[PDB]
RNA sequence: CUUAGAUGUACAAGGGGUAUUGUAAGCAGUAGAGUAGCCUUGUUGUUACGAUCUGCUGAGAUUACCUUUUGUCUGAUUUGU
RNA sequence: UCCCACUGUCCCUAUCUACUAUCUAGCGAAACCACAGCCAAGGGAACGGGCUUGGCAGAAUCAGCGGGGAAAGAAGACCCU
RNA sequence: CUCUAGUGCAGAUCUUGGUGGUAGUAGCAAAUAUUCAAAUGAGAACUUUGAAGACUGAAGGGGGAAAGGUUCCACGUCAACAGCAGUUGGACGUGGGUUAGUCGAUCCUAAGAGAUGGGGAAGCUCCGUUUCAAAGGCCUGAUUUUAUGCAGGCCACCAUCGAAGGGAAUCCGGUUAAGAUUCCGGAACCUGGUGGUUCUUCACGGUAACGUAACUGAAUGUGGAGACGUCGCGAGCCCUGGGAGGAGUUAUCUUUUCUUCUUAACAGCUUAUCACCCGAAUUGGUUUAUCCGGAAUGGGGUCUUAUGGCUGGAAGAGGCCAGCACCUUUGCUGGCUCCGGUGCGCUUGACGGCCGUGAAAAUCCACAGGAAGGAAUAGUUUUCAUGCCAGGUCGUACUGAUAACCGCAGCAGGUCUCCAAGGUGAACAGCCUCUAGUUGAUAGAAUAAUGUGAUAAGGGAAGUCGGCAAAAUAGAUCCGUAACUUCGGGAUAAGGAUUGGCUCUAAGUUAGAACUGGUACGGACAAGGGGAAUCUGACUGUCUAAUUAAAACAUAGCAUUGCGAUGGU
RNA sequence: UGAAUAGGGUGAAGCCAGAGGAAACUCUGGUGGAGGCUCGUAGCGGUUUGACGUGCAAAUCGAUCGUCGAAUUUGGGUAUAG
RNA sequence: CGAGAGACCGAUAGCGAACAAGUACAGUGAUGGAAAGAUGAAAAGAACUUUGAAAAGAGAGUGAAAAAGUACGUGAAAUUG
């Protein structure tokens, strides 16, 4: 018994995917008769055609997590991401953070706050 | 694909050739069998 | 086993169909034709094509 | 093949008693160390927060247990020369 | 190969678990067609359920298991033209 | 009444087909739970809808090309036909829908190739195209017109063909049984028809000046570009908060708790690199610095490119969320906040530094600057202002891990290739939710033997062709450690010791102190067995497509011999 | 001729500085570049073991094993036929 | 293209094919290529009545005969009551 045409047609007039769209299971008559998508876009004003979305992907677990773990508990070793002093390459970590020297060092010379054999 | 010229009415000699085997055969015959052998099938052959 | 699937690729096509006859080994690189020719220069007719 | 069929215990089902890992939430109370707000200061007192502490009690959950009660089994089919 | 720790591979097997076998519905394969189907002794186209004598052998039915006949199959692998 | 021919069936692992046989037996399509209620009906586990759960989410999400070609779609049927039912289907049948200068359909360079004519020669074919050809400038004559078009004469400075790398344009919404950079609504750009002048060089007038009539095609280059091996350090580019609206949870209890909202093509504005800062006195840049910059010098002196930010468009538009009409079916009308801490995009072929030594071309750049010290100011075989028509010529549905491709097949398959959120673990392992999707053409109950999973006393290799199988161990950080070298090596050898968490050291990397407990601090997940003696091919590498992964052969390297290339072959 | 390797560890050669050495050795730090240096994914290879062979592909499926800036892998176009 | 005949067939023969045989189909493919004939004089091809849901089952009419009923000659066996 087909609603197949209705089925189809009822994701694309609200914009949502192929399974989310729900129906209301009481006035169904008029569903089927409202093949077109100029017709079930008046089914749009009734609310009949809504998404199955009655999941909130909340925030509270992920970002309570997060702050103890980047703040340094529960990551001394056990669960640890990045070894120690490394995570991005050691090499240019060490180098990096000699060269962070430069931003420091150099504006002493330019602004008058020692000599140059200094 | 690109489709070009003298493709595309060879293809739509094909997909009018898909239609049944003709009514009025049976009416030659009456009843008795006569089974034929072209059309095309979308799964099965291509044109030529 | 070497055979079927790898037949399935088939990316270079080689052979489409003659105009006046039906013999479909008219080659886009080749241009040949077993039968009566296309191009030909007179019919292409054959002794050998036929045991009776 | 043993067995139960209202007459009665074969199962589940309704209750009581015992064991199974062993000392819960709930509720009450105690000891030791550190920090902050507010108040006083030679002094200290008060309030707030997190871990540690004390007491009930073999607690609660809880299997096929021992012991005792609750729920159901018409017709139709159909046999002695 | 020697040497250290060691090991279900075995000694030594048991127990519990997943899935099916048992059993049922539906639609529905496969190459596939010898009269026939006991054993001990005896003769013998030469190792007989089948032929000679003697002992033995009933039917309705289903689950099992690898000994023969020698399965599912290709005109043998040795071997010569 | 007698003569003549394709003249008698049991068979070559034969021949033309139906029917028998195993047999209604197996199979019934790779172990991603399913439970319950309804709509409709002759029939409902399956269509379809609701409640609820398994399941995946670097794909069960999204999405283009080849190849195919209308299979999508709506309408309409349950017969044949679907590994079963079946209300269902691309099977069956009928029609519709795919609107481009706009997205693809071109020139020249490479792999590579074509067309044409005659000959060399036996054809094939090579060769010619390279000089005419092809294309362009200048001069003359006859005819005709709103224009025009043709013929003759003159000019040496160039010559094969084809990309993926080289070679036009574009964003956003409405709407559809379906879709528009396409229809359509709003705003752009390319292609032709209307209005405004700058230098060499020259004439007339005027002149510190500047104004204007006669007639004005125009860059086959000196020289430079489009133009190609490997490789390294920078310095910038986030999670979250703030403010506004709404609700305190079936059960003890909760209004600074959670969630939703938090936005927008273009032009103007105007930054790193380079070089007349070559030159170089001097010294900004972790710096070794000859270098280049604050700062200073010429001759008279300054400039290009450009992540981001600032400004304009936007008078206006959306949106958390509500107020009315009211026929109570159905239709409208009103409305909020707006801000601060940061990647692998882009910036860097320069620079650093090595070699195997870096391509070729049409369009096009290239085609040599004068005025005022510079300041300042204008135009360009260029750019601004402004009006009307036309855009060729098809592919365009749609599938693109598929029922359209593709394994003869409704078969456990082949199959180019696009996009990249949160927290946990390096990344792109694992872990787990979103945007977001879904459990297949038969089913129920018990759950033998036998084939498919784990556990355990005692022993410790004792067993079997066969340590095959199976066990010991594992991270972070510190200590401690073996022969000998082609000096490029071996080292994680052996032998030992400790973790997370919380407090404290410092009101902000990380490491050092300090305390307790359990079977155990990596507690899921995840994560090395060691000692002693011995061979060959130097090393990396090539390999028998349906029973031979090697000691076969190659390898950088080296020598003799052919051998002067019109070679040897 | 077109497309593809995220992540992560070391570092000669060149050049400078600092302690030390008659002088050279030695000896402590920074700057920096050449890898069959080297490591893990893409691309890509096949050692062991069990179930199949009247079944899904006319050599199949499950568990298990290798390489990756080098003698690297791969697509398309085009040519070579006993 | 037409006519006539030969010791020359009567749907396994013979032209590929007697008939919608190149037409439901299969292979890239000059191509392969099956199933396959049928009432009577007149179709009058069963009105009407009755049962069942369509299928299916009985009375009644038409017509020379319905002992000719559309799947339309004669009919055997495995198969199968």
Known sequence: ?118 | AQKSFRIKQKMAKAKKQNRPLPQWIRLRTNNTIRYNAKRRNWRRTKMN | ?52
């Open chain 3, 1 to 52: 086993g070497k055979g079927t699937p790898s037949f399935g690729k088939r990316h270079n096509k080689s052979h489409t169909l003659c105009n006046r006859c039906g013999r479909r080994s008219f080659h886009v690189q080749k241009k040949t034709c077993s039968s009566c020719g296309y191009p030909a220069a007179k019919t292409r007719s054959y002794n050998w094509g036929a045991k009776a």
């Open chain 1, 1 to 118: 018994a087909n609603l197949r045409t209705q089925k189809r047609l009822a994701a694309s007039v609200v914009g949502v995917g192929k399974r989310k769209v729900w129906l209301d299971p009481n006035e169904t008559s008029e569903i089927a008769q409202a093949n077109s998508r100029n017709a079930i876009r008046k089914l749009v004003k009734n609310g009949t055609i809504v998404k199955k979305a009655v999941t909130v992907h909340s925030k509270s677990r992920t970002r309570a997590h997060a702050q103890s773990k980047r703040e340094g508990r529960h990551s001394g070793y056990g669960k640890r991401k990045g070894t120690r002093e490394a995570r991005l390459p050691s090499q240019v970590v060490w180098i990096r953070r000699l060269r962070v020297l430069r931003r420091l060092l150099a504006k002493y010379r330019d602004a008058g706050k020692i000599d140059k054999h200094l």
